[PDB]
């Protein structure tokens, strides 16, 4: 009688997860948006006040896309006219609303087409980027000071990232770092003068008669990379009539002998900055610690204070060197480092000392350091019950490292095994956020004795509705391959019956440091395939996958498209043995790296798979960007790793594709994984006479995520899998 | 027979038609290559000898792509390093070989990357184009004289066409015309400075890291057109010291007032040139007659012998103003003109007098004038038996117009109903070429008494092979719609049984002045579809179609995408009535204009069609080029015909596509119908929520004709059609 979870339910979002997104603004209060009202909440007592009425700006004249309140509460930035660029970057217009008064400030407005804007950490200074140059406003109504004059579209970027830094290094458009004081503005400058341009057509609305050509500086593997410089300006000594002076901070000589990246920026105190640099060959990095000389007005970085991080087994950090967390006085810090057994744990460094001290150890990894006080360090790890796909909050007593208390493991052990967290300033309180395996649960806690204060959102509304649907369930378990555990999950049809044989869809990603088997609750395409189409959707984390130490993660070093492709295959065989999978109906699919792996598997001739779907696949590593690819594959030269570059293409395997049904899909405006990668696959298949199915999506990018395209691609894919599985 | 004509037979050319391609080199001799030997034949007596032995260039080194023998038989042009550009244009390398000395020329060679070369009509002068400039060689071993200095890639073309002139106007890359003497070289010059560029990606071999962007000056409907100038140079007065003096001949003043085209160049005598010009609104055309003033070195085009052609119902000519055929003295000419009743017939013009005299008349049309002698004019027409899809050779006695003799009608009336012809110099002999309904037949004849001399090729070898195969038959007939007859053909499966019900594939082109129902014999995809899959393949010639008078051809004027579309739908209903059609299984497909009509049809919500395939469709007329589109559609301005431009798009019909299965195919490097057109179709279907199948072919142009792609697309379409018809 009860309904199933339908494709339409997925597509139209019938069943919504409620969130509780808060922003701490002090040690005891947070802001929360509620029915477009902005409320301030007091953590200890839970009482609230309306800070911004949803009726304010009703007559503002534009739909306001976003807001940002200055730290000390005197102003609010209103973002409107948002126009998205890449994954993080975008352009917009801005108004400032004086809260003390009740006026929009009318003159010296932040310009249209501004590329980035930030408040300082304290007060109400602004820094923004417009036409690739940096500007500073001391007060919201005063004329800004121009800090840089070198900005040039597509060539010199001040205070914002170029394409490859945004996507691969900072995961952000911003390249601006205020000191905790607001006294100094640090920024990077990127120079793309000789980076080659990827070009592709954008077709736009039907009314455009000639297609547009988009051209983006974009280093493919082995190509010329952007260069970077780092500067710090004193925002307290700006002059109306004198250009502002930026002091440059140069990379360490061991970086200057070749191509290198600036990869981390972190203020330690009001007068100390930490910079991390990374060689183009990403197995060697340097942390520089630079102090302000108030007499010189200059910045010096003592070589004695440098810290070096090397890898023998692979690359530095999971995707990049980890962030250091400085003690209050700035003379020491903690960061995650891979230990001698290859597990990532918390290491304590002292700035004038050479080696660090491990504060944690064991056959599990620290995921992130979340907070630090003088008595305790709080971190997320997957230690609980030895499950790599679980996540919990722990605290370590800094006076006795043997005293670790888990703060989340036992709160709600059946419902909650995957936590993330958000601490107020000075770590007086924290919000816990459980993501599964039960429905997401948001709770507020006091750090004093780690006492629960109250439930913030328990998603009871969603619970009511789902009691009316036949939901699939999820199994998280492991198999053994050559003496080692590798984890998988299965999304199982409702009323699962291990005596019947089900079709199986292998959902893959398997890029380096990926994890597809975990304890989080999701409502997605797979929910539909299991609930309505009675398909099992499996995912497997093989060699190359993360959060289980370097032996596993680095197995793939200089060898992309090998072990992680074989392992997805062997996992599929082992699934086939289990007595509830029809071995005649095994499919595979994935997006991006998942599309690469899907294609390499389908072209392996294993005979294990009936059909597969690759969406926006990499096909050849020379086509993808330098920073991501070289991190794992080194350089595509005869002296380095050219030979596995050439050995790991989808194209070289065209012939074996005649054994399977293949659907190939790609967006024509994909700035990230270029349509090119897919166009070379289809051409190789044609050359060898293999029939297959294709679908391009006009003007969609890597995400294929406009509402209509998103509905369309999943509708198309369902049909393909239904037909491949002889489902009616 | 047991065996059928298979997809593989089509794809791999199991059964080849033999041809007999000769070139006349005088009034009674022709060259014909047998094996790789070049033979010279004597037409009167049929005897022959080897002109050039196949073993002459074994040591030449390069693969010779083609050859051209000079008129006086002394030299031969060898063409290698052939590189195709658009439909007619290409670059190549050239060697010249002295036939008397029996040695290759080594001094003053024709440059690499030459764009066009042509002997003078007499003797052995050479004119060629290189880097967009014209050069002339008096002797094959002497330095060439440079004629123009203005050539610049993609901007100034001397002696060759730009894109839209090659494709839509001259159907040729060449824009050079030797006078009959070889004394004068006339050439056109095209100026693309302000013509917008169409841009698209070319991906090339896998090894190319960054896709290349192709850029071509291409006027879309309504955009700035290239401009043209016309020049004549005296080749007998060239100096190695002084520059070549090119005399310009300017368009008439009635053309100069706005945008216009040079549409035809014809030498009449040694000192008389004919130029036809065409207004950009292509219902107005002017023919100039220009004479050399020997005493001034100038060319004068007097208005006394200027002729005007206008249309009130449509455009001028079938695709352009027809060619003039001058009598020997240059004082008069014959050309095809639409008469008072809208049928195209031969008209007699006397240079300095008004009007012309029609010398043919009737309900039918002359397809072309083929040859002109002192006594007779030879032309092809579809008079015979009132079949508009047949072609026959006639001659009209010049001294008495009522004396018309059909020369081909009765040669073999059951095998042969579609002839073309090739006359020798001065029309002493002609080769007849019959293309259907039976197997092709080549014969030689003499003009004196129209005696049949001998058979050249009768395709007996093909004949015996096909006797062993179950071949389809071809039905050619008409339905009456109003009081008008409209012709159609059916390719019928072997052992056709009118009591059975067969699935039907409507094969459409249906562009202006097209004809898809004729008596030609073809071995193509439809053959496979009828012979092996027992599918009926029908084509219908409705309103807009040619060779049946203006009333029918012009019906579509300024309204593309209406009657020709409706009529295809109406034909299928008629076909449905006929009791041998399963009206639950009717499909449609077409390429280019057929792709556009197919989609308009599928988007009409008519319910007659289950599925259809569009290959490289036009989707919106603003996307296609100015010369073709504007010819039928006028300009897309509010004051002209913008409303129907906007009413006749495929995109506006997307909603109705949810009623049919649709396959959309396009090549990414299509320089003619830009991929843009299908890119916008799929986008409209996505935005509307309609599922469909698609396939791009990377780096393929409009013909998708690389042998791997050609095999692939037809294999893909075959699978699609067989599933739509449930044909196991
Ligand atoms: C697929 N998403 C492409 C192709 C391979 C994985 C490279 N990839 C990326 O887009 C990367 N830039 C990602 C995006 C995101 C954050 C980082 C890790 C990642 O696994 C997920 C890949 C960099
Ligand atoms: C597809 N055939 C495209 C799109 C519309 C029909 C116009 N077309 C052409 O390619 C034209 N340039 C043609 C090519 C060839 C010779 C001329 C008449 C034509 O019907 C066949 C179309 C111009
Ligand atoms: C954000 C908020 O409302 N906090 C209030 C605080 O301002 C007030 O002083 C206190 C006493 O009533 O109650 C609490
Ligand atoms: C500083 C600035 O550019 N302000 C502009 C304003 O002048 C303009 O009227 C509006 C629309 O573009 O956007 C904002
Ligand atoms: C503002 C800036 O630094 N631009 C530089 C430019 O001076 C230099 O010529 C080029 C060569 O790499 O690199 C970039
Ligand atoms: C092309 C050819 O072979 N023509 C020959 C001709 O050269 C010759 O003079 C004649 C001899 O009778 O026979 C004929
Ligand atoms: C006629 C001419 O220029 N010949 C050239 C030859 O010299 C050259 O070696 C070859 C490769 O570039 O191309 C051809
Ligand atoms: C050789 C030639 O004709 N070049 C012309 C140029 O002089 C003119 O400025 C341009 C503008 O249309 O067109 C082109
Ligand atoms: C024979 C002679 O004078 N040569 C000229 C050359 O100098 C000049 O550059 C060109 C026009 O640009 O015309 C030619
Ligand atoms: C009055 C009228 O035009 N009715 C029909 C029309 O619908 C059709 O298009 C035409 C030719 O088929 O025959 C007539």
Same domain flag for A447 and A486? no
Minimal C-alpha gap between A678 and chain B (Å): 9
Cis peptide before A437, with omega less than 30 degrees from 0? yes
Distance CA B101, CA B668 (A): 49
Same domain flag for A410 and A512? no
User: Is-contact B279 B596, C-beta < 8 A?
Assistant: no
User: Is-contact B107 B140, C-beta < 8 A?
Assistant: no
Q: From the CB of B481, is ligand 10 less than 6 Å away?
A: yes
Distance CA B412, CA A16 (A): 79
B42 three-state secondary structure: strand
Distance CA A419, CA A438 (A): 12
Residue A210: its chain B contacts at CB < 8 A?
196-199, 220
Residue by residue, DSSP assigns B633-693 as H---STTTTHHHHHHS-SGGGGGGGGGSEEEEEEETT-SSS-THHHHHHHHHHHHHT---E
Residue A462: its H or E element:
helix A460-466
Tokens of A689: 């006479």
Nearest CA to A360 out of A375, A382, A332 is that of A382
User: Is-contact B278 B252, C-beta < 8 A?
Assistant: no
Same domain flag for B521 and B584? yes
User: Is-contact A541 A549, C-beta < 8 A?
Assistant: no
Nearest CA to A75 out of A54, A93, A51, A58 is that of A51
> CA separation (Å) from A211 to A266, A309, B505, B623, B704?
44, 48, 34, 10, 22
Nearest CA to B412 out of B430, B434, B394, B388 is that of B434
CB contact burial B682-720 (16+ within 10 A = b; e otherwise): bbbbbbbebbbbbbbbbbbbbebebeebbbbbbbbbbeb
Partner residues linked to B201 by β-bridges: B213
Nearest CA to A693 out of A724, A668, A648 is that of A724
B715 three-state secondary structure: helix
Distance CA A511, CA A435 (A): 23
Same domain flag for A155 and A170? yes
Same domain flag for B74 and B8? no
Q: Do B679 and A696 touch (CB under 8 A)?
A: yes
**CA B713 to the chain's CA centroid:** 23
Catalytic pick among B670, B674, B682, B718? B670
Same domain flag for A378 and A483? no
A300: CB partners within 8 A, 6+ apart: A290, A291, A293
Same domain flag for B300 and B159? yes
Q: How many structural domains are present in chain A?
A: 2
Resolution of this entry in Å?
Answer: 2.3
Tokens of B122: 């007499």
Last residue of a domain, one of A459, A483, A515: A459
Nearest CA to ligand 1 atom 1: A592
User: In angstroms, what is the span from residue B564 Cα to ligand 10's centroid?
Assistant: 12
- For the CA of A512, the closest atom of ligand 1 is 20
Other Cβ atoms within 10 Å of A111 Cβ, number: 13
B25 in reach of chain A (CB within 8 A): no
User: In angstroms, what is the span from residue A112 Cα to ligand 7's centroid?
Assistant: 57
Distance CA A513, CA A631 (A): 12
Nearest CA to A631 out of A677, A599, A593, A590 is that of A593
Tokens of B534: 């027992």
User: In angstroms, what is the span from residue B262 Cα to ligand 8's centroid?
Assistant: 17
Query: Residue A31 has what DSSP assignment?
Result: E
Backbone angles phi, psi at B602, to 5 degrees: -65, -25
Other Cβ atoms within 10 Å of A599 Cβ, number: 30
Query: Residue A323 has what DSSP assignment?
Result: P
Last residue of a domain, one of B459, B490, B525: B459
Q: Which of residues 172-211 of B touch A (CB under 8 A)?
A: 196-201, 203, 206, 209-211
Edge-first strand order for the sheet with A441-446 is A419-423, A429-434, A441-446, A451-457
Ligand nearest to the CA of A73: 3
> What lines the ligand 3 site, CB under 6 Å?
A 29, 40, 42, 45, 47-49
Distance CA A276, CA A285 (A): 7
B529: CB partners within 8 A, 6+ apart: B491, B505, B535, B537, B718, B721
Supply the CATH number for residue A665's domain: 3.40.50.1820
Distance CA B145, CA B135 (A): 6
CB contact burial B387-421 (16+ within 10 A = b; e otherwise): bbbbbbbbbbebeebeeeeebbbebeeeebbbbbb
Using a 10 angstrom Cβ sphere, with 0-12 exposed, 13-18 middle and 19 or more buried, the burial of residue B312 is exposed
Q: Do B206 and A708 touch (CB under 8 A)?
A: no
C-alpha torsion sign, points A72, A78, A83, A84: positive
Query: Residue B171 has what DSSP assignment?
Result: S
Q: Are strands B473-480 and B502-507 parallel, antiparallel or unpaired?
A: unpaired
Distance CA B83, CA B113 (A): 9
Ligand 1 pocket check: which of A88, A546, A628, A677 to mutate, most ligand atoms within 8 Å of Cβ? A628
Query: Residue written as tokens 């050069």?
Result: B135
Residue range of the domain that includes B513: 1-13+468-728
Same domain flag for B512 and B365? no
Q: From the CB of A150, is ligand 5 less than 6 Å away?
A: yes
Q: Do B708 and A687 touch (CB under 8 A)?
A: yes
Same domain flag for A236 and A351? yes
Q: Which residue in chain B is spatially nearest to A201 when comparing CA positions?
A: B200
Residue by residue, DSSP assigns A180-249 as TTSSEEEEEEEE-TT--EEEEEE--STT-SS-EEEEEE--BTTSPPPEEEEEEEETTS--SSSPPPEEE-
Using a 10 angstrom Cβ sphere, with 0-12 exposed, 13-18 middle and 19 or more buried, the burial of residue A518 is buried
> CA separation (Å) from A140 to A96, A100, A127, B378, B722?
7, 13, 10, 89, 69
Partner residues linked to A460 by β-bridges: none
Same domain flag for B429 and B479? no
Tokens of B529: 């579809």
B317 three-state secondary structure: coil
Ligand 7 pocket check: which of B106, B112, B135 to mutate, most ligand atoms within 8 Å of Cβ? B112
User: Is-contact B633 B623, C-beta < 8 A?
Assistant: no
Using a 10 angstrom Cβ sphere, with 0-12 exposed, 13-18 middle and 19 or more buried, the burial of residue B518 is buried
Tokens of A162: 């170029």
B121 three-state secondary structure: coil
Query: Residue written as tokens 């393909």?
Result: A720
Supply the CATH number for residue A53's domain: 2.140.10.30
Nearest CA to A423 out of A407, A409, A435, A411 is that of A407
Ligand nearest to the CA of B592: 2
Q: Which of residues 266-285 of A touch B (CB under 8 A)?
A: none
Q: Can you give the C-alpha Rg of chain B in angstroms?
A: 26
- Residue B528, phi-psi category: left (phi > 0), alpha (psi -120 to 50), beta (remainder): alpha
C-alpha torsion sign, points B67, B70, B76, B81: negative
Helices of type H across A298-437: none
A3: CB partners within 8 A, 6+ apart: A468, A469, A470
Cis peptide before B282, with omega less than 30 degrees from 0? no
User: Is-contact B40 B30, C-beta < 8 A?
Assistant: yes
Ligand 2 pocket check: which of B87, B161, B171, B628 to mutate, most ligand atoms within 8 Å of Cβ? B628
Partner residues linked to B712 by β-bridges: none
User: Is-contact B707 B722, C-beta < 8 A?
Assistant: no
Backbone angles phi, psi at B573, to 5 degrees: -65, -45
A707 in reach of chain B (CB within 8 A): no
Q: Which residue in chain B is spatially nearest to A719 when comparing CA positions?
A: B691
Last residue of a domain, one of B427, B459, B491: B459
Distance CA B413, CA B647 (A): 47
Q: Taking the C-alpha atoms of B271, B272, B273 and B277 in order, what is their torsion angle to the nearest 10 degrees?
A: 150
Query: Residue written as tokens 């008008």?
Result: B484
Partner residues linked to A406 by β-bridges: A394
Nearest CA to ligand 7 atom 10: B112
Tokens of A164: 């490859």
Nearest CA to B226 out of B258, B251, B259 is that of B259
- Residue B533, phi-psi category: left (phi > 0), alpha (psi -120 to 50), beta (remainder): alpha
Residue B715: its chain A contacts at CB < 8 A?
689, 691
Nearest CA to A388 out of A344, A440, A334, A442 is that of A344
Backbone angles phi, psi at A99, to 5 degrees: -75, -35
A351 three-state secondary structure: coil
User: Is-contact A507 A474, C-beta < 8 A?
Assistant: no
Q: Taking the C-alpha atoms of B102, B107, B112 and B115 in order, what is their torsion angle to the nearest 10 degrees?
A: -80
Same domain flag for A285 and A219? yes
C-alpha torsion sign, points A394, A399, A401, A402: negative
User: Is-contact B206 A649, C-beta < 8 A?
Assistant: yes
**CA A29 to the chain's CA centroid:** 27
Distance CA A77, CA A54 (A): 15
Query: Residue written as tokens 């057509």?
Result: A201
Nearest CA to A321 out of A330, A308, A340, A332 is that of A308
Distance CA B544, CA B549 (A): 10
Query: Residue written as tokens 């810090």?
Result: A333
Minimal C-alpha gap between A210 and chain B (Å): 6
Residue by residue, DSSP assigns A148-173 as ----BTTTEEESB--HHHHHHTSSSS
Residue A419: its H or E element:
strand A419-423
Nearest CA to A7 out of A723, A717, A725, A728 is that of A717
Residue A196: its chain B contacts at CB < 8 A?
210
Residue B717: its chain A contacts at CB < 8 A?
none
Distance CA B584, CA B412 (A): 41
Q: Are strands A22-24 and A536-540 parallel, antiparallel or unpaired?
A: unpaired
Tokens of B197: 């560029």
Same domain flag for B524 and B386? no
C-alpha torsion sign, points A111, A112, A116, A119: positive
Distance CA B676, CA B666 (A): 9
User: Is-contact A712 A682, C-beta < 8 A?
Assistant: no
User: Is-contact B546 B19, C-beta < 8 A?
Assistant: no
A635 in reach of chain B (CB within 8 A): no
Distance CA A383, CA A364 (A): 5
What own/partner pairs with CB < 8 Å and gap ≥ 24 does B718-721 have?
B718/B7, B718/B525, B718/B528, B718/B529, B718/B533, B719/A691, B720/B611, B720/B613, B720/B663, B720/B693, B721/B505, B721/B529, B721/B533, B721/B535, B721/B587, B721/B589, B721/B611, B721/B613
């Amino acid at each position: 009688s009860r309904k199933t979870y339908t494709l339409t339910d997925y597509l139209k979002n019938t069943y919504r997860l409620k969130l509780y997104s808060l922003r701490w603004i002090s040690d005891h209060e947070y802001l929360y948006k509620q029915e477009n009202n902005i409320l301030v909440f007091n953590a200890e007592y839970g009482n609230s006040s309306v800070f911004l009425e949803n009726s304010t700006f009703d007559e503002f004249g534009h739909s306001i896309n976003d807001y940002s309140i200055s730290p000390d509460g005197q102003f609010i930035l209103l973002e409107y006219n948002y126009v998205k660029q890449w994954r993080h970057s975008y352009t917009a217009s801005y108004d400032i609303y004086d809260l003390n008064k009740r006026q929009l400030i009318t003159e010296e407005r932040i310009p249209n087409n501004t590329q980035w804007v930030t408040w300082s950490p304290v007060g109400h200074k602004l820094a923004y980027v417009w036409n690739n140059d940096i500007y500073v406003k001391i007060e919201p109504n005063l004329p800004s000071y121009r800090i840089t004059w070198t900005g040039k579209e597509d060539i010199i970027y001040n205070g914002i990232t170029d394409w490859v830094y945004e996507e691969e290094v900072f995961s952000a458009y911003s390249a601006l770092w205020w000191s905790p004081n607001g006294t100094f503005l640090a920024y990077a400058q990127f120079n793309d003068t000789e980076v080659p341009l990827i070009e592709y057509s954008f077709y736009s609305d039907e009314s455009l008669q000639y297609p547009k050509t988009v051209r983006v500086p974009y280093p493919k593997a082995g190509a010329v990379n952007p260069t970077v410089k780092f500067f710090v300006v004193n925002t307290d000594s700006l002059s109306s009539v004198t250009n502002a002076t930026s002091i440059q901070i140069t990379a360490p000589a061991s970086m200057l002998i070749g191509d290198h990246y600036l990869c981390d920026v972190t203020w330690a105190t009001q007068e100390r900055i930490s910079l991390q640099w990374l060689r183009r060959i990403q197995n060697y990095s340097v942390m520089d610690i630079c102090d302000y000389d108030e007499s010189s007005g200059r910045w010096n970085c003592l070589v004695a204070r440098q810290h070096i991080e090397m890898s023998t087994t692979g690359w530095v950090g999971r995707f990049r060197p980890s962030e250091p967390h400085f003690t209050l006085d700035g003379n020491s810090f903690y960061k995650i480092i891979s230990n001698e057994e290859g597990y990532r744990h918390i290491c304590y460094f002292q700035i004038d000392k050479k080696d660090c001290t491990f504060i944690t150890k064991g056959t599990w990894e620290v995921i992130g350091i979340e907070a630090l006080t003088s008595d305790y360090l709080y971190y997320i790890s997957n230690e609980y019950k030895g499950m790599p796909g679980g996540r919990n909050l722990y605290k370590i007593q800094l006076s006795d490292y043997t005293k670790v208390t888990c703060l989340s493991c036992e709160l709600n052990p059946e419902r909650c095994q995957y936590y993330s967290v958000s601490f107020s300033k000075e770590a007086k309180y924290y919000q816990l956020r459980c993501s599964g395996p039960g429905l997401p649960l948001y709770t507020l806690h006091s750090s004093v004795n780690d006492k629960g204060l109250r439930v913030l959102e328990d998603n009871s509304a969603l619970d009511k509705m789902l009691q009316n649907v036949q939901m699939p369930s999820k199994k998280l378990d492991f198999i053994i391959l050559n003496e080692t555990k590798f984890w998988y999950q299965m999304i199982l049809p409702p009323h699962f019956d291990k005596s019947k044989k089900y079709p199986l869809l292998l959902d893959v990603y398997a890029g380096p440091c990926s994890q597809k088997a975990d304890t989080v609750f999701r409502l997605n395409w797979a929910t539909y395939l299991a609930s309505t189409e009675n398909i099992i959707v499996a995912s497997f984390d093989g060699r190359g996958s993360g959060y289980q130490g370097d032996k596993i993660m680095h197995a793939i070093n200089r060898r992309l498209g090998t072990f992680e492709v074989e392992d997805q295959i062997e996992a599929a065989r082992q699934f086939s043995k289990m007595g509830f999978v029809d071995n005649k109906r095994i499919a595979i699919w994935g997006w991006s790296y998942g599309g690469y792996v899907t294609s390499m598997v389908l072209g392996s001739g294993s005979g294990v798979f009936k059909c597969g779907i690759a969406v926006a696949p990499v096909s050849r590593w020379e086509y993808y960007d330098s920073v991501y690819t070289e991190r794992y594959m080194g350089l595509p030269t005869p002296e380095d790793n050219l030979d596995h570059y050439r050995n790991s293409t989808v194209m070289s395997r065209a012939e074996n594709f005649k054994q399977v049904e293949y659907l190939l899909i790609h967006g024509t405006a994909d700035d990230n994984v270029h349509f090119q990668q897919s166009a070379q696959i289809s051409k190789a298949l044609v050359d060898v006479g293999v029939d297959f199915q294709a679908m391009w999506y006009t003007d969609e990018d890597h995400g294929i995520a406009s509402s209509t395209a998103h509905q369309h691609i999943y509708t198309h894919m369902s049909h393909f899998i239904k037909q491949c599985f002889s489902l009616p």
